[PDB]
Design a protein around this motif. Structure first.
Motif, PDB file in Angstrom:
ATOM      1  N   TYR A  18      46.774  34.192  37.915  1.00 50.48           N
ATOM      2  CA  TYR A  18      46.584  33.742  36.546  1.00 50.48           C
ATOM      3  C   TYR A  18      45.431  32.750  36.479  1.00 50.48           C
ATOM      4  O   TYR A  18      45.227  31.965  37.412  1.00 50.48           O
ATOM      5  N   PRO A  19      44.649  32.772  35.388  1.00 49.70           N
ATOM      6  CA  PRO A  19      43.336  32.097  35.402  1.00 49.70           C
ATOM      7  C   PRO A  19      43.380  30.575  35.393  1.00 49.70           C
ATOM      8  O   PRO A  19      42.351  29.961  35.706  1.00 49.70           O
ATOM      9  N   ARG A  20      44.506  29.958  35.016  1.00 51.40           N
ATOM     10  CA  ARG A  20      44.706  28.505  34.968  1.00 51.40           C
ATOM     11  C   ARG A  20      43.700  27.800  34.055  1.00 51.40           C
ATOM     12  O   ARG A  20      42.971  28.444  33.292  1.00 51.40           O
ATOM     13  N   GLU A  21      43.682  26.459  34.111  1.00 51.28           N
ATOM     14  CA  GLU A  21      42.614  25.639  33.538  1.00 51.28           C
ATOM     15  C   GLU A  21      42.111  24.680  34.607  1.00 51.28           C
ATOM     16  O   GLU A  21      42.911  24.123  35.369  1.00 51.28           O
ATOM     17  N   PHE A  64      52.179  48.134  34.980  1.00 52.61           N
ATOM     18  CA  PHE A  64      53.455  47.465  34.744  1.00 52.61           C
ATOM     19  C   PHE A  64      54.617  48.389  35.093  1.00 52.61           C
ATOM     20  O   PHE A  64      55.613  47.953  35.694  1.00 52.61           O
ATOM     21  N   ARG A  74      53.499  40.327  24.808  1.00 55.06           N
ATOM     22  CA  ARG A  74      53.953  39.299  25.728  1.00 55.06           C
ATOM     23  C   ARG A  74      53.575  39.638  27.161  1.00 55.06           C
ATOM     24  O   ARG A  74      53.349  38.710  27.946  1.00 55.06           O
ATOM     25  N   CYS A  75      53.379  40.936  27.477  1.00 59.26           N
ATOM     26  CA  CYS A  75      52.972  41.285  28.838  1.00 59.26           C
ATOM     27  C   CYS A  75      51.643  40.646  29.197  1.00 59.26           C
ATOM     28  O   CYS A  75      51.556  39.960  30.229  1.00 59.26           O
ATOM     29  N   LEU A 102      52.025  36.969  30.071  1.00 60.50           N
ATOM     30  CA  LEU A 102      52.390  36.556  31.427  1.00 60.50           C
ATOM     31  C   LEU A 102      51.279  36.831  32.432  1.00 60.50           C
ATOM     32  O   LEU A 102      51.427  36.520  33.619  1.00 60.50           O
ATOM     33  N   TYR A 103      50.161  37.416  31.996  1.00 57.39           N
ATOM     34  CA  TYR A 103      49.095  37.672  32.945  1.00 57.39           C
ATOM     35  C   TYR A 103      47.721  37.346  32.378  1.00 57.39           C
ATOM     36  O   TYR A 103      46.717  37.551  33.067  1.00 57.39           O
ATOM     37  N   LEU A 104      47.642  36.844  31.139  1.00 49.69           N
ATOM     38  CA  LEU A 104      46.348  36.365  30.651  1.00 49.69           C
ATOM     39  C   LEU A 104      46.441  35.081  29.852  1.00 49.69           C
ATOM     40  O   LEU A 104      45.397  34.487  29.568  1.00 49.69           O
ATOM     41  N   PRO A 106      47.286  31.540  30.606  1.00 46.20           N
ATOM     42  CA  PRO A 106      47.558  30.741  31.805  1.00 46.20           C
ATOM     43  C   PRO A 106      48.696  29.754  31.600  1.00 46.20           C
ATOM     44  O   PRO A 106      48.958  29.282  30.489  1.00 46.20           O
ATOM     45  N   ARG A 107      49.381  29.456  32.699  1.00 43.97           N
ATOM     46  CA  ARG A 107      50.586  28.638  32.700  1.00 43.97           C
ATOM     47  C   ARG A 107      50.231  27.218  33.118  1.00 43.97           C
ATOM     48  O   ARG A 107      49.635  27.011  34.179  1.00 43.97           O
TER      49      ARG A 107
END
Lengths: 380, 185, 43, 22, 184
Positions: free
Chosen positions: A42-45, A229, C32-33, C36-38, C40-41
């Motif tokens: 995941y790309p984060r910040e 998926f 929502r898919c 969870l993959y674009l 960011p958390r």
């Protein structure tokens, strides 16, 4: 006394932009998207997108450097390479006029339309991503939600029919696990569909199913990432099903015959044999659901809490009780219409749902057909 | 202006040199090639008579081995290989000869039209050694020949032979002797 | 659409046969898919 | 007139002999 | 540009279809099938480019023009003669309950006012038909399967189905189920 440049040190090493990540990984954009959709990157910040690169924009996305380093050192890069080479070989065989060599090469390719199994082997990635089982349940929430919708979704070029049948079979095996172990606890239905909450090993799982209806896929949607998926969650749910069935001692995979499933057995097609408050709800009663009612969800709820005998119409499915309404054995019949046997009791599925939700046997008189129904509640 | 790579320039200049010099008749005869329709008919017959690949040969041999564990006629195939085909032409066994037009050491095939003319075997020049190669499961094939066939299409082979000897041999008959190329004009 | 704080309003129904299926389900599920993959958390 | 007919006939002859694809 | 072999092939197919049409028109149209009315699914496949006038009229009466279109059709003497006329273009046979159920649940659309909507609500189908006895989608499911008087209006109501093109998946009685299984 050493002069060190500001650009080459700091947040520049720590985060790498999307373009440089794809250039270093030396893959195409969809294949890189598949690798990230499988590894979960995941790309984060960054703390400062200014300190990462000189030409920066807020619309651009970054990535962790160690995530890219994990991305390089995978067995799946070589798999991408020799599978693209095998596509070159099958195209060569097609252009050369060799039909038999084409058949041999497509047998060797294991292409996921004649099989239904996922195209790649994803054992090690799901082993590294999920170290234990409760994380597998936590992602199985979304995995099982995806699969139930996909089993109620049609087929196109990107999503063939055979792994849709595998989605159907695997979801039905999971439902057989739930109706054997009574792991289902809560069930709430709506204009989404029906959400279900089940506890497994002290972990709650919520998952949503839409109704048996034509769903339009109008708009701009990508179906290749849908297929990624798909195969990811066939891998997860198959391994979760095998682990859970070995935990409960039931043999896996349980057998199903093609004759009765081709007659419409649905949940009665799969036979499960034990060796290789929920139970007190509907312990010994008799249930029949009519031709109007959705057969799958109420059968799932009724078998989930150990109701012994549930029957339905001949055209709704196959492998049930006697479909005659004149049989005096059936006590409760679920109807929703705009017979009238005195010994038989005419009820509505709202009565079933409130009896399941409250566990207190809400009365059939208050939920009688032909009258305005008192409201229920969402127990979550 | 911009600079082209060296080998591309060598390729194009070899084009212009091989097409605009005074080419001898033995080499200039190779610029006259079968048409699309006659090549399609010939390749339909030769695709009916392709040899077997390695997989089919091992599969058949395994079948005979297990049949012996628990009757045939002479196989009929397209004959290939330069020395083999030359030996077939010299012994008047070949019935039709298809010669590729892009053999890079062209000496290997310049005598072949004259040899087929001398021994009386009908011949034709085809476009592509890679095409003849696909037929015999190889990368390339300088020449292929058909000698004899199964009964059920003998007539077809005969018609094909007549076709080339009416459709290619008389259209080549006068220009097979003349020098090619030149920049007169 | 997508200008709303809440995406649903309750609608009263008298029977399960009266309940239809909302089809944008797939798309919002699809939505929502890539969440969870674009999306960011952030901890 | 005549030139157009000749060009069309030559184009049809090239399509019959050398084919249409490429 | 079109070559001479195409012209001669076309003519040979048209001639063979002409003698075949004369043969079926001359011979008395009695199939080796009991006189009881049955139900068959019909899916039309690519075949001959040029359609003779009687086959295109029968295909228009059975509304099969677009790519991969399927329709359920009764089996009596007249319909047997009609489907025997258009045999080389269609493939037919007895469907199964799961076949029609899945086929209408994945691809079931409706026609009203000359336009084609997806089946979205049961209120939509009740506004579309009203009073012939149908009340939901399961109603026209067992109306299609179990025989009844309401075949014609229900068949006119439903758009025919545009099944997805397969990747490799005469007359037969049971292999059609695997066909529509792979057609979906």
């Amino acid at each position: 006394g050493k002069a060190k440049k500001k650009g080459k040190s700091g947040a520049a090493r720590n985060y790498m932009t999307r373009t440089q990540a794809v250039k270093k990984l030396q893959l195409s954009l969809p294949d890189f998207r598949k690798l990230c959709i499988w590894k979960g990157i995941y790309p984060r910040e960054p703390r400062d997108r200014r300190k990462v690169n000189k030409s920066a924009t807020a619309s651009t996305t970054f990535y962790y450097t160690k995530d890219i380093q994990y991305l390089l050192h995978e067995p799946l890069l070589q798999k991408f390479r020799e599978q693209k080479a095998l596509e070159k070989k099958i195209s060569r065989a097609l252009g050369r006029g060799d039909v038999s060599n084409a058949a041999r090469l497509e047998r060797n390719a294991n292409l996921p339309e004649k099989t239904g199994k996922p195209r790649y082997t994803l054992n090690h990635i799901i082993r590294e991503r999920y170290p234990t089982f409760q994380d597998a349940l936590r992602d199985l929430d979304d995995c099982l939600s995806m699969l139930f919708l996909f089993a109620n979704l049609p087929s196109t070029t990107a999503v063939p029919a055979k792994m849709i049948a595998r989605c159907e079979r695997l979801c039905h095996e999971f439902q057989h696990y739930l109706i054997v172990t009574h792991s289902l606890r809560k069930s709430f239905l709506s204009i989404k569909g029906i959400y279900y909450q089940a506890n497994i090993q002290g972990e709650d799982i919520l998952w949503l199913v839409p109704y048996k209806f034509n769903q339009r896929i109008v708009g701009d949607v990508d179906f290749r990432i849908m297929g990624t998926f798909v195969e990811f969650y066939m891998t997860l749910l198959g391994f979760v099903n095998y682990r859970l069935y070995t935990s409960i001692g039931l043999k896996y995979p349980p057998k199903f015959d093609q004759v009765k499933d081709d007659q419409g057995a649905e949940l009665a097609a799969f036979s499960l044999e034990g060796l290789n408050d929920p139970s007190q709800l509907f312990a010994n009663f008799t249930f029949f659901l009519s031709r109007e009612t959705p057969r799958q969800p109420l059968e799932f709820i009724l078998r989930a809490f150990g109701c012994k005998r549930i029957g339905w119409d001949a055209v709704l499915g196959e492998g049930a009780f006697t479909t005659d309404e004149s049989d005096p054995r059936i006590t409760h019949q679920i109807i929703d219409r705009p017979g009238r046997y005195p010994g038989r009791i005419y009820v509505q599925p709202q009565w079933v749902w409130d009896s399941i939700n409250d566990e207190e046997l809400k009365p059939p008189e208050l939920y009688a057909p032909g009258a305005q129904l008192p409201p229920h509640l969402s127990p979550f | 202006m911009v600079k082209w790579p060296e080998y591309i320039r060598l390729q194009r200049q070899k084009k212009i040199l091989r097409m605009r010099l005074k080419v001898p008749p033995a080499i200039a005869q190779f610029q006259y090639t079968l048409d699309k329709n006659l090549a399609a008919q010939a390749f339909k017959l030769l695709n009916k008579y392709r040899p077997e690949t390695k997989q089919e040969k091992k599969e058949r041999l395994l079948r005979e081995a297990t049949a012996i564990k628990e009757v045939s006629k002479k196989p009929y195939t397209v004959k290939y290989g330069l020395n083999h085909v030359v030996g077939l032409i010299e012994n008047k066994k070949a019935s039709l000869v298809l010669i590729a037009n892009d053999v890079d050491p062209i000496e290997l095939v310049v005598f072949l039209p004259a040899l087929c003319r001398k021994m009386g075997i009908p011949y034709a020049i085809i476009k592509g050694k890679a095409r003849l190669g696909t037929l015999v499961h190889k990368k390339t094939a300088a020449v292929v020949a058909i000698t004899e066939v199964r009964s059920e299409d003998k007539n077809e082979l005969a018609k094909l032979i007549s076709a080339v000897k009416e459709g290619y041999l008389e259209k080549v008959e006068d220009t097979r002797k003349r020098w090619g190329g030149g920049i007169m004009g | 659409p997508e200008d709303r704080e809440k995406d649903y309003l309750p609608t009263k129904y008298d029977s399960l046969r009266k309940v239809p299926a909302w089809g944008n389900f797939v798309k919002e599920r699809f939505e929502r898919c890539m969440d969870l993959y674009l999306a960011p958390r952030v901890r | 007139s005549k030139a157009a007919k000749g060009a069309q006939a030559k184009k049809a002859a090239q399509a019959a002999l050398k084919g249409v694809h490429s | 540009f079109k070559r001479a072999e195409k012209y001669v092939k076309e003519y040979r197919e048209q001639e063979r279809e002409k003698i075949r049409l004369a043969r079926i028109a001359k011979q008395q149209g009695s199939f080796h099938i009991p006189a009881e009315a049955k139900l068959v699914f019909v899916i039309r496949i690519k075949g001959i480019n040029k359609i003779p006038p009687k086959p295109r009229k029968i295909l228009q009466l059975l509304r099969l023009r677009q790519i991969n279109n399927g329709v359920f059709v009764k089996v009596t003497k007249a319909t047997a003669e009609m489907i025997k006329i258009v045999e080389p273009w269609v493939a037919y046979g007895y469907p199964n309950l799961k076949s029609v159920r899945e086929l209408i649940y994945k691809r079931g659309y409706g026609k009203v006012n000359g336009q084609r909507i997806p089946l979205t609500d049961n209120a939509i189908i009740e506004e579309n038909l009203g009073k012939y006895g149908i009340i939901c989608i399961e109603d026209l499911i067992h109306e299609i399967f179990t025989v009844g008087p309401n075949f014609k209006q229900a068949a006119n109501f439903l758009w025919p189905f545009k099944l997805s093109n397969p990747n490799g998946g005469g007359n037969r009685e049971e292999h059609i189920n695997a066909l529509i299984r792979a057609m979906n």
